[PDB]
């Protein structure tokens, strides 16, 4: 209900200044705020439709036509040629030039307090600063000394769009808000979007009298005035209520936009009214921009540093695994430190059909089995599909309520393979980590901080670490390939040391012939020519080309139709001696039941 409000078209202005909407056609004022008549001279009635040029007193810079991209002119000096000695305070005006309309927003110079040159030492220091933490506080303190504001804080948005005050500088008399968590709903998405547009936004006095724009909708277009870039835009009464509720009288926020995303906000509070002149808003913009800059650089650098150390450790594991042929206890005991490190796990369990190799801080062997079963279950087959490369939980008691316990050691885990593939598996665990969420209340009466203690949840699985996990998926197929390769060579060796003389035949196609896949030494000896020089040979090669049509037909039939045949046939005898053997051909069971291979035993 709240996330749906205009806020960019309230048709109201903060009374401290004046707004005018001018038709870029020739120069006539089409819309103006009720405050315009008081300071401009000509009252409301005749001021509307009047050329801006009648009140043309822009000494520094003038507006101009715009093609497509709206150009925004800075705050420069402005006068009034209607009244003799117009106000008491000095006035400055900024332009918002659009292809459809123009907008001029004026406010007092304020003067009083090179203030941009004076900002440079603070900027120059945050630039050099390591860690976001150190920067945040330097800005909080620095800006608190630079600008007046009784309370200045750094509000950081978390993943779920909730906020946390990471830094704060305030008058020792005020009760510190450092460490406070606020819901996402406190700053709705509609709001957040504007903070990427207008980056520095100040409220001079909470509970001001909103000066409305006289022709609410454009008299010639029929559309309301989209402020969005106007600094004198009237903020939502929802926020104003909330502000008044917390006893604040003045505001100034600066958007911490990092990688085109609103990372955080600089939030300033004055418990007495305060207007920050165009000069200071450009200073806070500067310090916001430098902070956004540094926080994003530090993010970038350290993300890259981590990615590399993980890769070097990932490779170390992959190689040492491919090297050793037998998975011993010491291999896995020397593997485990790093196998844990690569994902920042507290424990790791390696499974290999009925066996488990538990390492670090992991639940008991029986408990790990209870987990694996629950994961590989039919009911939980939904999770495995929706999961990316690996299955992972941040709180076990939520995804698998049956495994509500175990959470003290396995609150979070990473399971791979994602398929119910079995034999080889890997379980990375992260033990429970209790969290105190220092709230601000649970429109509301606020103040009172409620400290929500959260059990059964581990540390959030880093996306960096999750792709680092998905990367080691290879250790599973590696284990498996190495196992099948072990039993295969065993059986290939077994087969080759036989006396009966056997060959395996791969069924061909309509353009491919029936070839030999495997042949033992006992078979290759009856054919004279060695084993390696018979593999990949057509079956017609093997028997002589002087054989009876009746006998070969019987065999060819069994090959053509995938049937079995027992036929005595002469062999392709290079020497001469007539050698005849009983050709036992037997179809081997296929999953489709459609013959793919045959076994050929030779004994007459």
Ligand X SMILES: */C=C/C1=C(C)C(=O)N/C1=C\C1=NC(=C\c2[nH]c(/C=C3\NC(=O)C(C=C)=C3C)c(C)c2CCC(=O)O)/C(CCC(=O)O)=C1C
Query: Which residues participate in the annotated binding site for biliverdin IXalpha?
Result: 2
**What would the x/- binding string for its own copies be over residues 466 to 495, using CB under 8 A?**
-x--xx-xx--xx-xx--xx-xx-xxxxxx
Minimum Å gap between C-beta 18 and its own copies is 22
If you ran DSSP here, which 8-state letter would residue 261 be given? Answer: S
What is the DSSP code string of 483-522? HHHHHHHHHHHHHHT-SS-EEEEE---SSS--EEEEE-HH
User: Which of these ranges, 195-203, 377-385, 388-396, 426-434, lies near ligand X under the rule CB under 6 A?
Assistant: 195-203
Cis before residue 417, ω within 30 degrees of 0? Answer: yes
Binding partner at 582 among its own copies, ligand X, none, C-beta below 5 to 8 Å by kind: none
Handedness of CA 69, 75, 76, 81 (dihedral sign): positive
Handedness of CA 427, 310, 166, 282 (dihedral sign): negative
Tokens representing residue 360 in the block = 């670090």
Within residues 116-175, the interface with its own copies by CB under 8 A covers 116-118, 120-121, 123-124, 127
**What would the x/- binding string for ligand X be over residues 203 to 222, using CB under 6 A?**
x-------------------
Minimum Å gap between C-beta 155 and ligand X is 6
The correct pick among 147, 235, 339, 479 for binding ligand X (CB under 6 A) is 235
CA 429 to chain centroid: 22
Query: Which residue, 145 or 185, is less far from ligand X as judged by CB?
Result: 185
Number of neighbouring beta carbons within 10 Å of residue 427: 24
Give the closest residue to 457 by CA, choosing from 495, 408, 497, 494: 408
Binding partner at 118 among ligand X, its own copies, none, C-beta below 5 to 8 Å by kind: its own copies
Query: Which residue, 117 or 549, is less far from its own copies as judged by CB?
Result: 117
Within residues 517-556, the interface with its own copies by CB under 8 A covers 517-518
Binding partner at 187 among ligand X, its own copies, none, C-beta below 5 to 8 Å by kind: ligand X
Distance CA 505, CA 584 (A): 12
Q: What is the largest CA-CA distance in the chain?
A: 133
Distance CA 270, CA 140 (A): 14
**What would the x/- binding string for its own copies be over residues 376 to 395, using CB under 8 A?**
------------xx------
The correct pick among 105, 186, 346, 432 for binding ligand X (CB under 6 A) is 186
Indicate the annotated binding residues: 2
Query: Which residue, 172 or 591, is less far from its own copies as judged by CB?
Result: 591
Distance CA 131, CA 302 (A): 9
Binding partner at 113 among ligand X, its own copies, none, C-beta below 5 to 8 Å by kind: none
Which residues precede a break in the chain, with C-to-N distance above 2.5 Å?
Answer: 113, 442
Query: Which residue, 300 or 526, is less far from its own copies as judged by CB?
Result: 300
If you ran DSSP here, which 8-state letter would residue 604 be given? Answer: -
The correct pick among 138, 201, 581, 584 for binding ligand X (CB under 6 A) is 201
Binding partner at 332 among its own copies, ligand X, none, C-beta below 5 to 8 Å by kind: none
Query: Which residue, 156 or 584, is less far from its own copies as judged by CB?
Result: 584
* Number of residues counted as binding ligand X (CB under 6 A): 25
Binding partner at 189 among its own copies, ligand X, none, C-beta below 5 to 8 Å by kind: none
Interaction of residue 191 with ligand X, rule CB under 6 A: yes
Within residues 57-86, the interface with its own copies by CB under 8 A covers 72-74
Distance CA 555, CA 584 (A): 9
Interaction of residue 329 with its own copies, rule CB under 8 A: no
Binding partner at 295 among its own copies, ligand X, none, C-beta below 5 to 8 Å by kind: none
Minimum Å gap between C-beta 216 and ligand X is 18
Query: Which residue, 171 or 305, is less far from its own copies as judged by CB?
Result: 305
Helix, strand or coil for residue 286? helix
CA 420 to chain centroid: 27
Distance CA 333, CA 330 (A): 5
Distance CA 139, CA 287 (A): 7
CA angle 75, 78, 82 (to 5 degrees): 155
Query: Which residue, 122 or 396, is less far from its own copies as judged by CB?
Result: 122
Distance CA 591, CA 604 (A): 31
How long a stretch of residues is the chain?
604
Query: Which residue, 79 or 423, is less far from its own copies as judged by CB?
Result: 423
The correct pick among 421, 436, 462, 561 for binding its own copies (CB under 8 A) is 421
* Separation in Å, CA 68 to CA 222, 223, 224: 21, 19, 20
Q: Show the beta-strand stretches assigned E in 226-305.
A: 250-257, 262-270
Minimum Å gap between C-beta 155 and its own copies is 21
Binding partner at 260 among its own copies, ligand X, none, C-beta below 5 to 8 Å by kind: its own copies
Binding partner at 460 among ligand X, its own copies, none, C-beta below 5 to 8 Å by kind: none
Distance CA 142, CA 154 (A): 12
Query: Which residue, 238 or 552, is less far from ligand X as judged by CB?
Result: 238
Token pair 């430098």 in the structure block, residue: 290
Distance CA 589, CA 593 (A): 6
**What would the x/- binding string for its own copies be over residues 568 to 597, using CB under 8 A?**
----------------x-x-xx-x-----x
390 touches 418 (CB < 8 A): yes
Interaction of residue 94 with ligand X, rule CB under 6 A: no
Binding partner at 177 among its own copies, ligand X, none, C-beta below 5 to 8 Å by kind: ligand X
Interaction of residue 436 with ligand X, rule CB under 6 A: no
What is the DSSP code string of 354-372? TEEEEEES---HHHHHHHH
| Residue closest to ligand X (Cβ) | 2
- Residues interacting with ligand X, by CB under 6 A? 2, 5, 7, 153, 177, 182, 185-188, 191, 195, 201, 203, 235-236, 238-239, 242, 251, 253, 255, 265, 267, 443
């Amino acid at each position: 209900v709240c996330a749906r409000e205009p806020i960019h078209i309230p048709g109201l202005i903060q009374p401290y200044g004046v707004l005018l909407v001018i038709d870029p056609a020739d120069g006539r004022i089409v819309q103006a705020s009720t405050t315009a008549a008081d300071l401009l001279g000509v009252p409301m009635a005749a001021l509307l439709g009047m050329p801006y040029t009648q009140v043309l007193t822009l000494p520094e810079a003038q507006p101009f036509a715009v093609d497509d991209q709206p150009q925004h002119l800075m705050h420069a000096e402005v006068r009034f040629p209607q009244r003799a000695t117009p106000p008491a305070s000095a006035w400055v005006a900024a332009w918002h030039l659009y292809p459809q309309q123009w907008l001029v927003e004026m406010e007092p110079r304020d003067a009083r307090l090179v203030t941009l040159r004076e900002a440079m030492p603070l900027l120059r220091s945050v630039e050099r600063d390591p860690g976001i933490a150190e920067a945040a506080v330097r800005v909080a303190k620095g800006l608190r000394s630079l600008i007046g504001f009784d309370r200045v804080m750094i509000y950081r948005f978390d993943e779920e769009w909730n906020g946390d005050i990471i830094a704060e500088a305030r008058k020792p008399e005020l009760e510190a808000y450092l460490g406070n968590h606020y819901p996402a709903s406190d700053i709705p998405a509609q709001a957040r979007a504007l903070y990427l547009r207008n980056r520095v936004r100040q409220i001079a006095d909470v509970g001001y009298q909103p000066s409305p724009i006289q022709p609410t909708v454009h008299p010639q277009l029929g559309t309301p005035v989209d402020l969005s870039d106007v600094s004198l835009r009237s903020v939502s009464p929802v926020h104003l209520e909330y502000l008044a509720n917390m006893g604040v009288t003045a505001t100034l926020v600066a958007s911490i936009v990092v990688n085109d995303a609103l990372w955080g906000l600089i939030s300033c509070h004055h418990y007495s009214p305060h207007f920050t002149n165009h000069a200071m808003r450009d200073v806070t913009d500067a310090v916001a921009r430098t902070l956004a800059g540094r926080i994003g650089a530090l993010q970038a650098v350290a993300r890259a540093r981590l990615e590399s150390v993980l890769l070097t450790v990932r490779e170390k594991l992959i190689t040492d695994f491919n090297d050793a042929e037998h998975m011993t206890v010491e291999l896995l005991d020397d593997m485990a430190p790093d196998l844990m490190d690569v994902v920042d796990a507290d424990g790791v369990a390696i499974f290999h059909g009925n066996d488990i190799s538990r390492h670090g801080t992991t639940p008991d062997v029986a408990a790990l089995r209870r987990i694996r079963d629950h994961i590989e279950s039919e009911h939980h087959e939904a999770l495995r599909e929706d999961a990316v490369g690996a299955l992972h939980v941040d709180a076990i008691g939520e995804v698998f309520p049956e495994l509500a316990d175990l959470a003290p050691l396995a609150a979070g885990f990473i399971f791979v393979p994602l398929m119910p593939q079995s034999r080889s598996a890997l379980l990375w665990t992260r033990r429970e980590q209790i969290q105190q969420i220092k709230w601000a209340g649970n429109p509301r009466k606020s103040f009172d901080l409620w400290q929500q203690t959260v059990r059964g949840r581990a540390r959030r699985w880093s996306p960096l670490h999750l792709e680092s996990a998905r990367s080691l998926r290879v250790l599973i197929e590696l284990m498996e390939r190495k196992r099948f390769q072990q039993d295969f060579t065993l059986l290939e060796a077994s087969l080759s040391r036989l006396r009966d003389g056997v060959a395996i035949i791969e069924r061909g196609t309509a353009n491919a012939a029936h070839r030999l896949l495997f042949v033992n030494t006992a078979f290759a000896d009856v054919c004279g020519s060695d084993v390696a020089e018979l593999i990949g040979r057509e079956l017609q090669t093997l028997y002589a080309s002087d054989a009876p049509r009746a006998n070969v037909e019987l065999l060819q039939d069994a090959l053509r139709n995938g049937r079995a045949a027992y036929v005595t046939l002469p062999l392709q005898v290079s020497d001469g001696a007539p050698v005849y053997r009983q050709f036992h051909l037997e179809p081997l069971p296929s999953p489709s039941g459609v013959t793919a291979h045959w076994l050929l035993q030779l004994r007459d």
